[PDB]
Amino acid sequence: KDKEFQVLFVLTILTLISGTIFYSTVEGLRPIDALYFSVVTLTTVGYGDFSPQTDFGKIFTILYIFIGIGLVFGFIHKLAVNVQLPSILSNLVPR
Amino acid sequence: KDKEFQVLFVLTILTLISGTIFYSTVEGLRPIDALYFSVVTLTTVGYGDFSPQTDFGKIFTILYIFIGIGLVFGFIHKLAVNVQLPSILSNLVPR
Amino acid sequence: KDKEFQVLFVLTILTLISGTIFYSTVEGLRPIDALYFSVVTLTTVGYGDFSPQTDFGKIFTILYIFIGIGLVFGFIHKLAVNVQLPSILSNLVPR
Amino acid sequence: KDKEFQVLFVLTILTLISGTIFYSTVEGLRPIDALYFSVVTLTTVGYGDFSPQTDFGKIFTILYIFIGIGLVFGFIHKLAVNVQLPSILSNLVPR
Ligand SMILES: [K+]
Ligand SMILES: [K+]
Ligand SMILES: [K+]
Ligand SMILES: [K+]
Ligand SMILES: [K+]
Known part of the structure; x- marks a missing residue:
């Protein structure tokens, strides 16, 4: 799972x-x-503080979003369940 | 699944x-x-760089969002698991 | 399920x-x-075209978001799987 | 589950x-x-009404987002299924 985390x-x-x-x-x-x-x-x-001004940018963003959201959310998910959660559990009991 | 991907x-x-x-x-x-x-x-x-200025636009966006989010997210999901993931796996082993 | 859809x-x-x-x-x-x-x-x-300007508004939005996202996403979900999907399937075969 | 809700x-x-x-x-x-x-x-x-103007802020936001989204969404989820839903069900029948 460290290797599942590491690929994402x-x-x-x-x-x-x-x-x-x-x-x-x-x-x-x-x-x-x-x-x-x-x-x-x-x-x-x-936020909208930065936003693409060129047509080449508007197009790139369309694809980057579709290709990119799946990965990013997947990492976040892996990060939360496989790293954040265990460390939370470990804090509730002392060594 | 290519045909599940193709309908979405x-x-x-x-x-x-x-x-x-x-x-x-x-x-x-x-x-x-x-x-x-x-x-x-x-x-x-x-982003908010473009946003609907007319009442006809504000209403259309309300429905387009509700009707549209379910599909779009579903495609993205299909795209990530059924296309992006396998191609990632295939890169880890050489032919 | 029409009654699950109707409550959401x-x-x-x-x-x-x-x-x-x-x-x-x-x-x-x-x-x-x-x-x-x-x-x-x-x-x-x-979008950010409208945004709360008062402190009373900023606070209301904090709670409305937390209380509201769970419902809204749940309706959308119910809407997509239980209404949009079947109607899509029905279009692929003629009566 | 009240204690699952309370940790999130x-x-x-x-x-x-x-x-x-x-x-x-x-x-x-x-x-x-x-x-x-x-x-x-x-x-x-x-919304984009507030947005980080300093480089120190832009960096903090990058991490806060990744570390923060997993938790926040998880609370919301716990909140909706384990608190909002039961109270909805309880309203449909009188004591
Ligand atoms: K936004
Ligand atoms: K915005
Ligand atoms: K947004
Ligand atoms: K969003
Ligand atoms: K989700």
């Missing part, structure tokens, strides 16, 4: 790296803003 | 075509902006 | 009526804008 | 307290605005 962890990093590079390059975001914009889109928070 | 794939295309046409016509969006606005609504990202 | 359908109407009345009264929205703002919040689209 | 209830309070304190301090929000901004992010509504 890596893939998520590679996916945010993807949006980071595209949005930095094409839409002109500082690298730090691209990553934050990539994370705010794929988790569907969607 | 088609239906999703027909649903985004619906919002594209309505928002282009009534709310005056360029076709490309309507589709992007339709995709950003039904996945609940909700 | 009613409850959802009562919940949107709640936000409609509160946001119209306290935050000064036209009734039509309140309902649309209520629907855009509880499905977590969150 | 507490943890959620502690998590919103976290964002409240960080966003008040670093991003300069009034305490009431931080909490509302924290609740609007972790449920992925994302």
Whole structure:
């Protein structure tokens, strides 16, 4: 399960790296803003402080969302049940 | 399952075509902006860069959301488990 | 199941009526804008075109979200599997 | 199950307290605005009326989202099935 977590962890990093590079390059975001914009889109928070201004960006976002949401939510799920939950349980009993 | 994927794939295309046409016509969006606005609504990202200004648009969006979220999420789900996951598994072993 | 659908359908109407009345009264929205703002919040689209400006509104929204998301998503779910899906299946075969 | 509800209830309070304190301090929000901004992010509504302006804030939000969504959604789930649902059922029959 650490190896189930690790495949979804890596893939998520590679996916945010993807949006980071595209949005930095094409839409002109500082690298730090691209990553934050990539994370705010794929988790569907969607603040709207950054948003794609070019047609090339609007199209990329359509696909990135569909391809990206499934992964991201899956990592989060793996993260919560397989890492957060056990550590919570372990805190309720002392060693 | 390719045929389960294909029914949710088609239906999703027909649903985004619906919002594209309505928002282009009534709310005056360029076709490309309507589709992007339709995709950003039904996945609940909700940037807010485009938003309906007319009462006819505000009402349409209420129903489109309820009718549309169930489908869109279902396609994404089908897409992730039945297409993304296997291709991931196949990459871990060489032919 | 029509009666499972009908309890979640009613409850959802009562919940949107709640936000409609509160946001119209306290935050000064036209009734039509309140309902649309209520629907855009509880499905977590969150355009941000309308947003609560008063402290009384910011607090109400905190609770309305927590109390409201569970219902709304549940109706949508019931709506998709128990109404949309069968009608889709029925279209694939002619009477 | 009251004790399953109570662990997710507490943890959620502690998590919103976290964002409240960080966003008040670093991003300069009034305490009431931080909490509302924290609740609007972790449920992925994302109005965008408040949004982090500093790099320290953009980074914190990236992690807070990933760590926070799993909990918050889990509480909401527990809240809906284990508290809202029974009270609904109890209203359909008189004592
Ligand atoms: K949003
Ligand atoms: K927004
Ligand atoms: K879900
Ligand atoms: K959103
Ligand atoms: K959302």
